[PDB]
Amino acid sequence: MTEYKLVVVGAGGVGKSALTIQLIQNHFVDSYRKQVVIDGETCLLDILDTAGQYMRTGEGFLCVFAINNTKSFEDIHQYREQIKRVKDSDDVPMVLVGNKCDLAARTVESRQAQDLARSYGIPYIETSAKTRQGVEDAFYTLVREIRQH
Ligand SMILES: Nc1nc2c(ncn2[C@@H]2O[C@H](COP(=O)(O)OP(=O)(O)NP(=O)(O)O)[C@@H](O)[C@H]2O)c(=O)[nH]1
Numbered sequence: 001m002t003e004y005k006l007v008v009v010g011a012g013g014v015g016k017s018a019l020t021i022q023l024i025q026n027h028f029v030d031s032y033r034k035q036v037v038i039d040g041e042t043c044l045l046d047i048l049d050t051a052g053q054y055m056r057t058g059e060g061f062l063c064v065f066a067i068n069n070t071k072s073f074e075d076i077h078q079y080r081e082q083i084k085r086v087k088d089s090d091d092v093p094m095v096l097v098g099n100k101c102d103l104a105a106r107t108v109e110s111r112q113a114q115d116l117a118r119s120y121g122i123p124y125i126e127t128s129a130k131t132r133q134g135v136e137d138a139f140y141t142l143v144r145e146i147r148q149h
Pocket residue numbers: 011012013014015016017018019028029050051052099100101102103127128129130131
């Protein structure tokens with residue numbers, strides 16, 4: 001089948017791993033493989049969980065930040081650029097993700113993340129690696145985004 005290399009990046013402690021492990025081992029709390037079918041087509045999801053050369057390899061990127069951590073939100077630009085850099089491209093498959101949407105201590109409005117997503121041209125999705133909510137839309141959207149290449 002077809003193979004996809006997804007790279008999850010983000011401010012430390014935002015839930016990069018929680019998400020990854022939620023998709024691979026279906027539960028709430030590095031290399032990961034996974035056979036899955038998306039929109040019919042069958043494919044291999046190669047997920048590389050990184051820390052809060054190997055990025056020139058990834059095909060699609062998951063820029064994550066927690067909605068209860070303003071700085072993690074302000075740091076997206078930093079990673080976005082570091083990516084945009086090591087891949088001489090102004091548009092690289094990628095999705096902005098606001099994790100921990102299960103909390104009430106929210107310091108980042110959605111209206112805030114959306115504006116930033118539009119200025120980028122990438123999709124924005126909120127996920128909770130705890131209630132597993134959105135954990136799939138996020139990853140599958142990133143794939144559909146890579147199929148546009
Ligand atoms: N309530 C809630 N907490 C979450 C969620 N995702 C992560 N956590 C919790 O917050 C902590 C950080 O999650 P973790 O995935 O380890 O963060 P990280 O992005 O991997 N940080 P690191 O840079 O150290 O690798 C853990 O205790 C985890 O259980 C979520 O969706 N909701």
